[PDB]
Symmetry: C2
């Protein structure tokens, strides 16, 4: 902004979109469903790159879960269901991931480096409350 | 939403605008500058109502200062406190511009998460270094 009015007008404006949003498997990081806010071979590359991010974040999630002794970790409760929200730097992108409570599924948000980690934590907690149908969801055999 | 793709598409979307944003005096809560996110007598009414909210929030801020959560923050060795207050249905966030006689004030709908107000107001405050230590003189 170039002046006070303009500064304030800018403070009114919403923060931008997430880059992508996913439900992925907690077991192998496979994508079950996804949305992006975004020619043919570009689309494929694009899905492959999503598959790679989901895998890496699941791997970091998994490491932190089993590490007895991570950008940050926030325990949350939803109707006496517990889960943990994690944030991760991913090559200049900001990511946020949480296990859907008692389930084999993770919810994953990916955003630009300017999107504040704190807002990801808030959004993912609010979103997780909409996914009660998926609480307890169990995958069976995958191969 | 109605299905999983729809739910995920919704999670992509930005949060809405603030209802309003302003710089007001820490002394009396008078408005110096403001912006809102959207007849004659409606426009005047609308300004009167902002004046009234600014006054009330300044009064609450004043109380808390000489004694609804509070987050201390630092911007290059300068300190200030971020406060959130429920209005009626509205969510509000106010912080003194460091070392100054000014407050920065955000007002949002009841659905706007307090935590985001706290985040936004700290980010916005960082663009306001020009106004650090600004002093009001006589206001007659």
């Amino acid at each position: 902004s170039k002046n006070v009015k303009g500064f304030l007008e800018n403070t009114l404006k919403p923060y931008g979109s997430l880059q992508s949003s996913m439900i992925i498997t907690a077991t192998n990081g496979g994508i079950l469903s996804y949305a992006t806010s975004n020619n043919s071979i570009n689309e494929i590359n694009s899905v492959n790159n999503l598959k790679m991010m989901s895998l890496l974040i699941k791997d970091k999630w998994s490491e932190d879960e089993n590490d007895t002794e991570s950008n940050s970790c926030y325990p949350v409760e939803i109707d006496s269901f517990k889960t943990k929200i994690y944030t991760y730097e991913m090559e200049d992108l900001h990511t946020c991931v949480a296990q859907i409570p008692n389930s084999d599924l993770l919810l994953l948000f990916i955003a630009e480096g300017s999107f504040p980690y704190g807002l990801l934590v808030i959004k993912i907690e609010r979103a997780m409350r909409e996914l009660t149908d998926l609480f307890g969801y169990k995958l069976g055999l995958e191969h």
